[PDB]
Design a protein around this ligand. Sequence first.
Ligand SMILES: O=C(c1ccccc1)c1ccc(-c2cc(C(=O)O)c3cnn(Cc4ccncc4)c3n2)cc1
Ligand SMILES: [Ca+2]
Ligand SMILES: [Ca+2]
Ligand SMILES: [Ca+2]
Ligand SMILES: [Ca+2]
Length: 433
Amino acid sequence: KQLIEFVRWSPERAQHYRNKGYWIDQPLTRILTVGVQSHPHSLAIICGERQLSYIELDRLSTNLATRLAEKGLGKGDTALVQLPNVAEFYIVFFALLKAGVVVLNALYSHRQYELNAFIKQIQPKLLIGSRQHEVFSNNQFIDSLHDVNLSPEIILMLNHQATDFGLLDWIETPAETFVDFSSTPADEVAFFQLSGTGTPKLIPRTHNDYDYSVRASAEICGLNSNTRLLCALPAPHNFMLSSPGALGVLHAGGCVVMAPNPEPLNCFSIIQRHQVNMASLVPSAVIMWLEKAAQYKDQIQSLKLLQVGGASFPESLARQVPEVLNCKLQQVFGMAEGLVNYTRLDDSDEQIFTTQGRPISSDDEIKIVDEQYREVPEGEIGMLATRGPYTFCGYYQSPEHNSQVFDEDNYYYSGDLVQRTPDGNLRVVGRIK
Ligand SMILES: O=C(c1ccccc1)c1ccc(-c2cc(C(=O)O)c3cnn(Cc4ccncc4)c3n2)cc1
Ligand SMILES: [Ca+2]
Ligand SMILES: [Ca+2]
Ligand SMILES: [Ca+2]
Ligand SMILES: [Ca+2]
């Protein structure tokens, strides 16, 4: 009966964030609802040969939601979802948001070891996966869950076997009866994000905070109804999902275009076929694209904006993006825990090629501290500490850790080493363990 527990912002910060218009107290489903009202038939997702309009995405996720509610899944319940980069990922996500089921999206590259840890932490009553995944190749994993009383009441499978509950069956046809359902409240948990090294920690994200990061990111990256965003990174990743990600593109009324991964030749033909004009990558993938871009120039001419985040992205490599990939560059330094930094579209070249940008919000607060947690002199290198309208206040059910990474003012210490540049942007120089 209880809603999932999580650490709240102080009432004072929550009020401030409402006052500024960051938190508008709407569910994440807002994105679909509004899209359906404005442009029901414009494309929301392109996946292989499939094309899903906004109203289709809306109907299909409502269908699955009704089926889950009919089975008694809802508020206070959790779910574990593990799907590849396919349209069903978003249908399921919006379905669970609609039903008020708090979902953890595992990476498709996660294995039974991680899945096991996730299941023990959130005890899902719903598990959705794919038979084509190693862990669900057989029933060894599922069975082993019964041997510990951690079996989900419901298990849906993509690429299902005849004796499976077929994910597409539950999506394609509504329930026989009508049970009532609705999203969890806007300042309560919507879903779990995952930290990015020894088994991902769970980051509760509320509707308010996530929708805000999405809406504000979309504005920063100039998304609009003509945006076609390649989704070649894992769909569940905070970067690919919200920065600005698929949610940001849907917020702006554009279209997400799926790819299994960042493999250059496949991505290039997808980009060409659908005239993709935006993409998001990590440096190792940018390098793969650079190796082939000269020869396949014609195929990627439609790219207008490439976001790059993660790892290390030296200036000399960054300059190759507009030079070889023939599109604008935007650097992104963010974290599933909250804070995201973007270079702005009207930043100087120097800023874009040598910094990782600046926070989404004027109310993203940042401390850069020395070994004694004193703020360093302006411009020096220090440890990042941060808080804001979309940065979390603690990991799920982890009081000991939380106390280790938050200070008395609820600043989060990400471990990143950073310096502020004179222009105002941030440069990430390393990481502290
Ligand atoms: O494509 C993947 C991936 C992840 C797991 C399995 C397979 C692929 C992927 C995608 C993004 C990152 C990744 C890693 C870092 C980092 O500091 O280590 C990082 C820092 N900023 N960003 C951009 C970012 C933006 C928003 N939220 C979080 C991160 C990063 N993205 C790392 C990996
Ligand atoms: Ca269609
Ligand atoms: Ca171009
Ligand atoms: Ca060029
Ligand atoms: Ca970190």
